[PDB]
Design a protein around this ligand. Sequence first.
Ligand SMILES: O=C(O)C[C@@H]1CCC[C@H]1C(=O)c1ccc(-c2nnn[nH]2)cc1
Ligand SMILES: O=C(O)C[C@@H]1CCC[C@H]1C(=O)c1ccc(-c2nnn[nH]2)cc1
Lengths: 226, 227
Amino acid sequence: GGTILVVTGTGTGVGKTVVCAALASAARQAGIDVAVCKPVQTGTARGDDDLAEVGRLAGVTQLAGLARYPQPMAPAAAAEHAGMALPARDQIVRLIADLDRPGRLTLVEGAGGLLVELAEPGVTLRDVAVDVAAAALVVVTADLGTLNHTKLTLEALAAQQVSCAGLVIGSWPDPPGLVAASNRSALARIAMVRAALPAGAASLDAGDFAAMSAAAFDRNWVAGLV
Amino acid sequence: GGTILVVTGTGTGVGKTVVCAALASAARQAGIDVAVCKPVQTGTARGDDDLAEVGRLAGVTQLAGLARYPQPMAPAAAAEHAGMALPARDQIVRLIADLDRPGRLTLVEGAGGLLVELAEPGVTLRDVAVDVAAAALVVVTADLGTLNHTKLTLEALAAQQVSCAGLVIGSWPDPPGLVAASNRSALARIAMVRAALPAGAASLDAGDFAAMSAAAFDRNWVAGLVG
Ligand SMILES: O=C(O)C[C@@H]1CCC[C@H]1C(=O)c1ccc(-c2nnn[nH]2)cc1
Ligand SMILES: O=C(O)C[C@@H]1CCC[C@H]1C(=O)c1ccc(-c2nnn[nH]2)cc1
């Protein structure tokens, strides 16, 4: 096998997709083969497609998914509004395990936060992480309230013995501000801050995003992932 | 002693203060003596005074504060900016113990979410609730992402055997969209929703706020809080 990392977040809209793209770009530039799995995607009616984002930003081609739901809701709510169940737990775990191979970094992007239901009955990305023996990278914001949501998420990981690979601030503001600067210092006292992506990084073209990603992550940490 | 309830939330600005006032108002209309304490209050340089708001909204007179910091930040950050220390864990416990009283409902309003540090080193409202054997009333939003934060908060409570007294939706929109309606039904299956306060309840005057508060909570549940 290779390395499987679930990329979760403290909640919704925190930067999970752009962090997945940034780490994939950084890993590829270190020579690592990268695959990204988005088991469940919602909000397709308005055009949401996180895998296509990763492919355009980081050039990844191994992009695996199982289900797409039109409504921009939690997967279980989007599934219910469409009248079709979520995928099975076996579907998600086996897709991830089949993606995994030696020399490869396989990133699993969840929907919303860690305890969001992704499969029936009540299966979350935390359950998936246990099943595939993956560590968890936690995407956090720099905004008011992030320390509480980070601590809650890390405790939920530890409660099921899921290792934490570190934190990433999904959007670092410019200029930072008092709360943002205080939060970044405190976040590093909670867990290892692997990167802070500049605000607006999701809008970069592929070449600019690759330069940003290469500078945002520590090269020794990236190469050490596989 | 009486009944101590810590009033926490899934995060910052979710309605902890208005829920404290609503439950205080509902208990006072049932004849229950209510005290509300605020161990750590930040944002005083902005005029934030949750105790003053609770008294203004619900008519609570027994209001007890402890630590006050100017900046509208997390307690640890607001204290550091002011060159001040956070209170001790026992100081928060003493604040609550001196209010505790048979026949009285003592609400302990937190700052931000459950794992926010209120005392050094890393002492949170969850630790306080263990010290004073209080249940925890969790204020949640109806907005996108609330189920995850609610589940995370309830799991944190269980991890230290802090009983969950229930959930309160801090602001319930009218009319509710698909997300808000979905979230409420899902929330009611995660735990018992004690009330869903209408949006803008914080802007009601004394008379209207009391009428809203009485209608928002099950009278049997409120009455059974204190014997
Ligand atoms: O992936 C994201 O974060 C953004 C997507 C964009 C479209 C919907 C978002 C989503 O999938 C989502 C996941 C969980 C929850 C939730 N958790 N607890 N209550 N509701 C809400 C939304
Ligand atoms: O009580 C509230 O929520 C509102 C008050 C109003 C003024 C600041 C708010 C506060 O006290 C507060 C508490 C914790 C955090 C936090 N948690 N994790 N990172 N930062 C942020 C703010």
